[PDB]
Amino acid sequence: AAAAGPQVFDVGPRYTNLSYIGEGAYGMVCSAYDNLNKVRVAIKKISPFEHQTYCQRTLREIKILLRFRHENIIGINDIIRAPTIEQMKDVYIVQDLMETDLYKLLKTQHLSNDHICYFLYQILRGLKYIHSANVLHRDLKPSNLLLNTTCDLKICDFGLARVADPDHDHTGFLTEYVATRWYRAPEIMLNSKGYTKSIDIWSVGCILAEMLSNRPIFPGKHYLDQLNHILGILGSPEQEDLNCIINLKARNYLLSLPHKNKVPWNRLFPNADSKALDLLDKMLTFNPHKRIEVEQALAHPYLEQYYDPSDEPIAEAPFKFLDDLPKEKLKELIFEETARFQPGYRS
């Protein structure tokens, strides 16, 4: 019994004065007023119950976000749903209102070196906490980095997140993959399921590059094209790195390519701070075993103004949970996961 330029956006007695925003993440987003807290908040209506995938992504995200508590990761403030499973058709997730995201910002604004440094610091600070919980985000990109007007940055969208599993990371050449193409690490196309922490560091390197130039560094138009963009900049992998790829099909593909030399980061980014480029290089390293880890990245000289490991907190314990559960049983776990926000007992 309240409408937003259709459709039904019914968020109960707490949240007044709706105001449409976007249409992302298989639902719809409005600004609204939190009468208990007296601040404007953001609300996403989620109607995922018709597709098993939507339900998977939704449960995964709610479980992680309710467990995490960190300044640089979006929190869930409230969840609104019907009082029974039967009546529950939609779920509304209430979060802090964030003005913009890095994707929208990069369309129109050039970043100062100071803004790049502070945004990168906050991304890595959030990622340290995520990785400390043994979780991989697996879809970091500018549109999943929320910003407010005071340059505070919060990571969102844990729909493809997974618990790290390096022992089961190996796969064959050209294995299909779901996360956003332009931010995929080279090993995804060669021999990796993206079950290790290094997958996220690559995505952060891509984001840094994009903050430096306002354009994606590796804009592949299709699955294999992505690998060739990467190789056009990094150059042919070195023998040691090629020897690490024991997958014959992936190794022979790399050996089949004509030799390409590295394109120097300062040719690519002539206006960039040289310490930023040194860190860039370390994040965009071909061999994931040689790729910098999140805590080393935080200690890099580029970030010296901000680095303070006592103020870079970690999760109080690892996270542990999947795809085998049907749409019906997923609705039930979602119902249980959101119980804490219910009025429940009222006299």
Cα separation of 106 and 342, whole Å?
39
Q: Which among 270, 182, 189 is positioned nearest to 237, based on CA atoms?
A: 189
**What is the spatial distance between Cα 203 and Cα 288, in angstroms, rounded to a whole number?**
12
Judged on CB neighbours under 10 Å (0-12, 13-18, 19+), 298 is: buried
Residues carrying an active site annotation? 139
Main-chain dihedrals φ then ψ at residue 291, nearest 5 degrees: -65, 140
- When computed from its CA atoms, the radius of gyration of the chain, rounded to whole angstroms, is 21
Tokens representing 23 are 């249409």
**Cβ-count burial 172-182 (b if 16+ within 10 Å, e if not):** ebebebebbbb
29 is in an annotated binding site: yes
Enclosing domain of residue 264: 98-323
**CB-side neighbour CA atoms (13 Å) of 208:** 32
Q: 217: exposed, middle or buried (C-beta count within 10 Å: 0-12, 13-18, 19+)?
A: buried
158 and 45 within one domain:
no
Residue 216, token pair as written in the block: 């994606």
Q: Tell which phi-psi region holds residue 309, choosing left (phi > 0), alpha (psi between -120 and 50) or beta.
A: alpha
Provide the CATH number for the domain around residue 31.
Answer: 3.30.200.20
Q: Are residues 312 and 179 in the same domain?
A: yes
Tokens of 35: 């009468």
Give the closest residue to 253 by CA, choosing from 196, 191, 185.
Answer: 191
> Beta-carbon neighbour count of residue 264 at 10 Å?
12
Q: What's the token pair of residue 307?
A: 């680095």
Name residues whose C-beta falls within 8 Å of residue 324's C-beta, 6 or more positions apart in sequence.
none
Based on the fold, state whether residues 171 and 265 are members of the same structural domain.
yes
Residues 77, 188 within the same domain: no
Compute the distance between CA of residue 291 and CA of residue 330 in angstroms, rounded to an integer.
Answer: 36
Method for structure elucidation = X-ray
21 among annotated binding-site residues: yes
- On whether both 201 and 265 belong to a single domain, the answer is yes
Residue 245 among known ligand-binding residues? no
172 appears as a binding residue in the annotation: no
Pairing of the two strands 100-101 and 135-136: unpaired
276 with 134, same domain: the answer is: yes
Contact 342, 83 (CB under 8 A): yes
- CATH number for the domain spanning 294: value is 1.10.510.10
Closest CA to 301 of 272, 285, 278: 278
CA distance linking residue 207 with residue 140, whole number of Å: 8
Q: Are residues 67 and 185 in the same domain?
A: no
25 is in an annotated binding site: yes
189 annotated to a ligand binding site: no
> Where is 104: in which H helix or E strand?
helix 102-108
28 assigned ligand-binding residue = yes
Same domain, 64 and 152: no
Tokens of residue 236, six digits: 């042919």
- For residue 217, what is the DSSP state? S
Read off the tokens for 309.
């490991």
Say yes or no: 85 and 197 in one domain.
Answer: no
Check whether 24 is labelled as a binding-site residue.
yes
Do 90 and 142 lie in one domain? The reply is no
